[PDB]
Amino acid sequence: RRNVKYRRVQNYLYNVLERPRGWAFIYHAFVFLLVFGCLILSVFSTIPEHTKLASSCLLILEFVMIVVFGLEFIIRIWSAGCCCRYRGWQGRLRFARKPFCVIDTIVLIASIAVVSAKTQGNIFATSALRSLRFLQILRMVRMDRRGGTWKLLGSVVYAHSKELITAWYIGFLVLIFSSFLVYLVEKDANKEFSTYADALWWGTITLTTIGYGDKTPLTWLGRLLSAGFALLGISFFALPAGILGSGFALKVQEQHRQKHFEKRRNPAANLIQCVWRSYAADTPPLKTVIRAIRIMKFHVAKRKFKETLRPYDVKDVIEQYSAGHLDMLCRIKSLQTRVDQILG
């Protein structure tokens, strides 16, 4: 009851902290907003004008984050008993060495030191604080789970490596060439295309559609060449964004389709059934043989599930199709042969 309730509160807090879903996302969004506001306030404090009000408002955030994050770390350590592998002093210590948890405590002590030094106000101390302010970004960093963003980005980039490389090479060529030509066309008339480095800077900014406007071609031949190469190189430089975005959309579509037609149901049901059968069986010799059979069934269901880990694709559908076709073929040929024997 009371201890079971305590267990429950701990499980719930563990899910809202480490495995957010629904409202836990609202809490994590609140923490993200707090961290982002801290970063904005620090940036504003960089400005000499607002460094007065911004410093005081940011000081408040220091303690606000400090108190909030200390409370969250206390809850996380007190929680994490959901799996029960971290219960007890040794389990809590094992949890505390989690890379994200060690990072969190390091950011925590850094914030404590920042507040304490702001209290003391030493010169080297205050410089160290101006430097230690960014650490709250590790809170933004810890946000993601095992760097899921980096892994997804890398996966999609690697899948489209040839296209990104092809596209980027072609675009680079375009840039170099256009820069050079304009430079030849404008090396003398325009004082800003004086060196080829200037032309390369203009081409980079031009094709990337930034277009600062510090360097722009003045000669009409230069403007014509710039227009043509602008159309080409702009298409090429915008290409990688389109390739990666389309790849992301296609991967999302594929993941959604696979989720809709996932194969987990029957293997899971069989696995649980035989697992409980073995747990129950764990004459005497007949019961032992049945136990061995049930454990084997559990292992087979585990193997089938591990096979099903592979996402469904054209491979699986065509495989099942061909299997069905071969079964019907062999069975109906056998029926024809049997009926023939009947005729004989």
Binding site: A268, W276, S278, V289, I293, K302, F305
Partner: protein, 144 residues
């Protein structure tokens, strides 16, 4: 493990019922036919295929010993059972209903005896909004 290997040898002798030293589909099927299970030919085929690793078509004594020695409590096996339970997790909050689980076990797959599913339900704390933490089941069935 002299007691364990002796038990395994006695079990193998019971399985094969002869001195051939190889376990064939027919004898393995008869082992359960004695209990009126009526095994299928494909069932026996996958039964044999899961112990041996050479593809000879029979279960040798060393192969059965290797199968039996390994412990069910494994990281891969624990993860597989955990995801099998998560198959029926709603909202990604790690909760599976007791009655829904009962219906799923009863209908889908090899039907469980009603009493056996009841014991499954009672083996852990089932109350608390009708949901049962599947990870508790995983811990109970991974302890060996």
């Amino acid at each position: 493990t002299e007691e364990q290997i002796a038990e395994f040898k006695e079990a193998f002798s019971l399985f094969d019922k002869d001195g051939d030293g190889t376990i064939t589909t027919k004898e393995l099927g008869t082992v359960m036919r004695s209990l009126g299970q009526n095994p299928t030919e494909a069932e026996l085929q996958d039964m044999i295929n899961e112990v041996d690793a050479d593809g000879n078509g029979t279960i040798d004594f060393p192969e059965f010993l290797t199968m039996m020695a390994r412990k069910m409590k494994d990281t891969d096996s624990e993860e597989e059972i955990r995801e099998a339970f998560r198959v029926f997790d709603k909202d990604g909050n790690g909760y599976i209903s007791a009655a829904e689980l009962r219906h799923v076990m009863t209908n889908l797959g090899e039907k469980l005896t009603d009493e056996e599913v009841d014991e499954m339900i009672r083996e852990a704390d089932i109350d608390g909004d009708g949901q049962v933490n599947y990870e508790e089941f995983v811990q109970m069935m991974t302890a060996k």
